DNA sequence: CGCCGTGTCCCTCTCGCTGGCCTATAGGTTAGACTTTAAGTCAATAC
RNA sequence: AGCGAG
DNA sequence: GTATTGACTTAAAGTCTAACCTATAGGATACTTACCAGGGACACGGCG
């Protein structure tokens, strides 16, 4: 505290302050450096506490050294917010801060798909409650029991356990020579048959459109945006051709009626 | 009559699923699998010129 | 063989591959320089007599 | 087959290079004197700060320069101390420490 | 594993407030048995041709 | 023929078809490339006959 | 398209350290044990001397 | 592009400048997708 | 202990460092031309096992001279990140997502790098920050090659994590399982039966 | 400066099939309805 | 993991 | 059949308000160091 106060006071006097005397300033810088020295000494002292605490969170979720470093951050925070005037042992206070830091790190940096904290806590709760109802009922508690013990709708139990489905690895040898990766079909690849089907569909659609009168072709084209991929309504086509909206609507109706005729439908079926 | 019946052994492919990270379609009759053309076969083709 | 050693040394040496053998051409998916792929047979000019 | 997906999708739409929306390349400058072009569309205000390829934010290089402000340093050990201690006791402790060091040096 | 969890919790167990039912966790044992009878290599899929 | 499966590949392009028909045709490959002794000569039942 | 992580502190490529012969060691004439000590914060090393 | 304009294939060390010249950005957060909306 | 006593006493007159950045400084203060010339003189004039070690070192000290390659590429300041679809995250049937086994190593690297940034920002004793730096070095090592140093980084099921170099080495690696040999379309398989009428 | 022992690294065929804790604050997000507007529609009409 | 051909 | 106007209803916004996620902080008895191969080649430390 003395070092921190010295640092703050000198920061205040760094602007529109006073030229402090050499001896007093030197002594005060010794105090500030001693404050940081004391902070480092305390942290180094309780690193053992951090390790002993993080021992109990090992084997699940993440590695051991990551837990130690998160606990070290928590202990730094505790030392920042530690009061002795309340007259209590340092370990008692720092234990809760280290526990909180480790638990938060587990919540965040443990799952490949990050579930935010509040969700993480509710799922961990669900797991514990089903574990205890497993200790009591023996058979895994059915969604009803959890929903009752958790004061949420049972569908909420469903979604809380759906969000918490850990991913798998596509590099698992499924045997016990083949990784799961090369057994999974890319379902978004050009299938090479629908591609040619679409090409021929566009070709035949263009031909059958060329059959009907030119204005008719133009109206249907610019209605569905076939020409350049931009579809518009009646008003736009009316504007571009300098005709009221209604004429375009009417010719569009006539076009649909014509193209629906069995003559120009058997050349376009088997594509839908 | 051994359980190696030809009905379970026949397989053919012209096009079908393709693997995820790479193309080179999935292998296996269970999928629509292409027949592996390994390095020995490729050496045989190189020898043929 | 020994892919890691080979690549470490090649990276250290700044080795440029001229893509002249059969394995390199196979890897990069271009015609091998053997048999029908050599420069004298590949670019035969064909026209009616 | 397990039949997975990368999410997203495909869209066969005949690629066009002829009739394309107009663009206005906007230059940004990071802290480490690195310019970065960004092809924004004309029909949208050019933002004043872009997270460039460098990985650090860069302001626009034209005029403008809105220069906003943000929260001061999220917190600080001194600030946390002032939420549990006051100035008079801290000053008293500073005096005790100062007298202790003075006694150490000269008695 | 159950023994280890029992010992670990025993430190944080309030004396005279504990009974074996609330001191024993069967989950590791059932988990080990289930992971053996499935995915253990000596627990093989019955071969009934 | 005691279960010896084999694979069938289909050349597509004009060059592939020409190579399969000329270079690889089974009736063009009688002698072994190793020693030159015929490899398609009769054996087993036919030699006995 | 690739990205890149900006390391807060430098690291050494493992291929040029552990792959026997240690190319970093041969370049710097540091024994593999010494290089492993320095790189993994087990022993200090002097980089300049006036 | 084309296997005819593939005359050489050089390999060498990639300096930090090359690494950050390839990059189109910087991955700064250790996240993959949203748990609920399943989007990047 | 000896180092600290030195630094507090004869702190000037010598600069000491620790870790990859120390190797960075060493390579920075390293003229390749003079070292190569001295090595060439030693191999030419000297003899014996000393000359043998000198000669092997000239197969790596010459390489960084003949080419205009810096010896600095060994030490990394930025780690490239492979495009996402080469390490896909796919929603398999049943919703069960499947990671790529490389997002885990990248996640570890990024977590440790961000934690190092925060530890340096806050101001931490050299013990914790040096431990964090060692962890970051180990994470990058595991990313580039698992199990080369120390026990391999293991995932669920107590199996090693498929690193970024395991994709290239071996009969199941990329160079040999997906480049020289591929699965092809327009292909079938079947049991063969003799036809003597053909 | 040789000879020896010990530690470490890389290699070990092709193809194919089947199936197995708790609380408190502050802030951002979305869903849901209201109001407006571009949009789709019908009826009568004149040339 | 069991299994087929060489 | 092709040129219009005047209503007449409708989906898509565009927006304001409310709840339900989200990033974040905190918690004071005391607890202080975790957990079966070979076969060849090359390189490093000891000893003579
Ligand atoms: Mg046979």
UniProtKB/Swiss-Prot annotation, chain C:
Membrane-crossing segments per the record: none
Function: DNA-dependent RNA polymerase catalyzes the transcription of DNA into RNA using the four ribonucleoside triphosphates as substrates.
Assembly with partners or alone: The RNAP catalytic core consists of 2 alpha, 1 beta, 1 beta' and 1 omega subunit. When a sigma factor is associated with the core the holoenzyme is formed, which can initiate transcription.
UniProt family annotation: Belongs to the RNA polymerase beta' chain family.
Name of the protein described by the UniProt record: DNA-directed RNA polymerase subunit beta'
Gene source species: Mycobacterium bovis (strain ATCC BAA-935 / AF2122/97)
Gene it is expressed from: rpoC
Covered residues, full protein: 1227 to 1275 of 1316
Curated annotation (Swiss-Prot), chain D:
Gene3D superfamilies: RNA polymerase-binding protein A (2.20.28.270)
Keyword terms: Transcription, Transcription regulation
Pfam families named among the record's database cross-references: RbpA
Keyword Glycosyltransferase: no
Domain of life: Bacteria
Alphabetical GO biological process terms: positive regulation of DNA-templated transcription
Single GO molecular function: bacterial-type RNA polymerase core enzyme binding
Family: Belongs to the RNA polymerase-binding protein RbpA family.
Subunit structure: Forms a complex with the RNAP catalytic core and with free principal sigma factors.
Known role: Binds to RNA polymerase (RNAP), stimulating transcription from principal, but not alternative sigma factor promoters.
Protein name: RNA polymerase-binding protein RbpA
Origin species: Mycobacterium tuberculosis (strain CDC 1551 / Oshkosh)
Curated annotation (Swiss-Prot), chain E:
Disulfide bonds: none
Parts of the chain that traverse the membrane: none
Family: Belongs to the RNA polymerase beta chain family.
Summary of the function given for this chain in its UniProt record: DNA-dependent RNA polymerase catalyzes the transcription of DNA into RNA using the four ribonucleoside triphosphates as substrates.
Subunit structure: The RNAP catalytic core consists of 2 alpha, 1 beta, 1 beta' and 1 omega subunit. When a sigma factor is associated with the core the holoenzyme is formed, which can initiate transcription.
Protein name: DNA-directed RNA polymerase subunit beta
Organism per entry: Mycobacterium tuberculosis (strain ATCC 25177 / H37Ra)
Species classification: Bacteria, Bacillati, Actinomycetota, Actinomycetes, Mycobacteriales
Primary gene name: rpoB
Swiss-Prot record, chain F:
Positions spanned in the full protein: 536 to 584 of 1316
Primary role: DNA-dependent RNA polymerase catalyzes the transcription of DNA into RNA using the four ribonucleoside triphosphates as substrates.
Residues where Mg(2+) binds: 2, 4
Family label: Belongs to the RNA polymerase beta' chain family.
Source organism per UniProt: Mycobacterium bovis (strain ATCC BAA-935 / AF2122/97)
Assembly description: The RNAP catalytic core consists of 2 alpha, 1 beta, 1 beta' and 1 omega subunit. When a sigma factor is associated with the core the holoenzyme is formed, which can initiate transcription.
Name this protein carries in UniProt: DNA-directed RNA polymerase subunit beta'
């Amino acid at each position: 505290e003395a070092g921190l106060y010295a640092t703050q006071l000198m920061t205040e006097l760094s602007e529109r302050g006073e030229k402090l005397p050499a001896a007093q300033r030197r002594d005060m810088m010794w105090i500030c450096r001693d404050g940081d020295r004391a902070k480092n000494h305390l942290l180094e002292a309780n690193l053992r506490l951090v390790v002993s605490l993080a021992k109990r969170y090992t084997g699940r979720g993440m590695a051991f050294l990551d837990l130690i470093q998160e606990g070290n951050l928590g202990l730094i925070r505790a030392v920042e917010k530690f009061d002795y005037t309340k007259g209590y042992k340092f370990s008692t206070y720092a234990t809760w801060w280290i526990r909180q830091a480790i638990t938060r790190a587990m919540a965040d940096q443990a799952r490949t798909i990050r579930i935010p904290v509040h969700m993480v806590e509710v799922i961990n709760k669900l797991g514990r409650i089903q574990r205890e109802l497993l200790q009591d009922l023996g058979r895994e508690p059915t969604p009803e029991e959890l929903a009752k013990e958790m004061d949420i709708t049972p569908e909420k139990v469903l979604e809380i356990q759906q969000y918490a489905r850990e991913p798998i690895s596509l590099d698992q040898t499924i045997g016990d020579d083949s990784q799961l990766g090369d057994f999974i079909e890319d379902s978004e690849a050009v299938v090479a048959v629908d591609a040619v089907s679409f090409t021929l569909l566009q070709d035949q659609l263009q031909s059958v459109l060329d059959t009907l009168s030119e204005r008719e072709a133009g109206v249907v084209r610019l209605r569905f945006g076939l020409t350049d991929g931009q579809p518009r309504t009646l008003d736009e086509i009316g504007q571009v051709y300098g005709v009221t909206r209604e004429r375009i609507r009417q010719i569009e109706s006539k076009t649909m009626s014509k193209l629906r005729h069995p003559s120009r439908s058997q050349v376009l079926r088997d594509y839908l | 009559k051994l359980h190696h019946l030809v009905d379970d052994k026949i397989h053919a492919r012209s096009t079908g699923p393709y693997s995820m990270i790479t193309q080179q379609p999935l292998g296996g009759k269970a999928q629509f699998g292409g027949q592996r053309f390994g390095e020995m076969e490729c050496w045989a083709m190189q020898a043929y010129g | 063989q020994e892919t890691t050693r080979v690549l470490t040394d090649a990276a250290i040496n700044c080795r440029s591959d001229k893509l002249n053998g059969l394995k390199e051409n196979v890897i990069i998916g271009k015609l091998i320089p053997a048999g029908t792929g050599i420069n004298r047979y590949r670019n035969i000019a064909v026209q009616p007599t | 087959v397990l039949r997975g997906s990368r999410l997203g999708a495909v869209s066969y739409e005949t690629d066009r290079n002829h009739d394309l929306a107009p663009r206005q390349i906007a230059r940004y400058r990071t802290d480490n004197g690195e310019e970065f072009e960004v092809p924004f569309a004309d029909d949208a205000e050019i933002p004043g700060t872009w997270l460039c390829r460098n990985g650090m934010e860069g302001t626009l290089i034209e005029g403008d320069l809105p220069e906003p402000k943000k929260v001061k340093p999220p917190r600080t050990h001194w600030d946390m101390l002032l939420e549990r201690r006051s100035i008079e006791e801290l000053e008293e402790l500073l005096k005790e420490r100062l007298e202790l060091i003075r006694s150490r040096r000269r008695g | 594993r159950m023994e280890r969890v029992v010992r670990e919790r025993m430190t944080t167990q309030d004396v005279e407030a504990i009974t074996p039912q609330t001191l024993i966790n069967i989950r590791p044992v059932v988990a080990a048995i289930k992971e053996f009878f499935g995915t253990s290599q000596l627990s093989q899929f019955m071969d009934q041709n | 023929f005691d279960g010896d499966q084999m694979a069938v590949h289909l050349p597509l392009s004009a060059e592939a078809q020409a190579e399969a028909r000329i270079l690889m045709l089974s009736s063009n490959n009688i002698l072994s490339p190793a020693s030159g002794r015929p490899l398609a000569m009769p054996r087993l039942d036919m030699v006995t006959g | 398209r690739m990205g890149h992580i900006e390391l807060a502190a430098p690291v050494t490529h493992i291929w040029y350290f552990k792959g026997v012969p240690s190319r970093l060691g041969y370049l710097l004439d540091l024994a593999p044990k010494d290089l492993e000590k320095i790189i993994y914060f087990a022993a200090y090393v002097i980089t300049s001397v006036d | 592009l084309d296997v005819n304009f593939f005359d050489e294939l050089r390999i060498g060390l990639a300096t930090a400048e090359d690494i950050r010249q390839w990059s189109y950005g910087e991955v700064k957060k250790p996240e993959t997708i949203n748990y609920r909306t399943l989007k990047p | 202990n000896l180092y600290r006593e030195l630094v507090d006493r004869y702190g000037e007159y010598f600069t000491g460092a620790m870790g990859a950045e120390s190797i960075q400084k060493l390579i920075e203060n390293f003229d390749i031309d003079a070292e190569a010339e001295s090595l060439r003189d030693v191999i030419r004039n000297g003899k014996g096992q000393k000359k043998l070690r000198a000669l092997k070192r000239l197969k790596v000290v010459a390489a960084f001279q003949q080419s205009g390659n810096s010896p600095m590429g060994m030490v990394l300041d930025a780690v490239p990140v492979i495009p996402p679809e080469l390490r896909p995250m796919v929603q398999l049937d049943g919703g069960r997502f499947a990671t790529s086994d490389l997002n885990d190593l990248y996640r570890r690297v990024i977590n440790r790098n961000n934690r190092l940034k925060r530890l340096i920002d806050l101001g931490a004793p050299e013990i914790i920050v040096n431990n964090e730096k060692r962890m970051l070095q180990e994470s990058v090592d595991a990313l580039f090659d698992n199990g080369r140093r120390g026990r391999p980084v293991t995932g669920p099921g107590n199996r090693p994590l498929k690193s970024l170099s395991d994709l290239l080495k071996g009969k199941q690696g990329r160079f040999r399982q997906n480049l020289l040999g591929k699965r092809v379309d327009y292909s079938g398989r079947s049991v063969i039966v003799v036809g003597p009428q053909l």
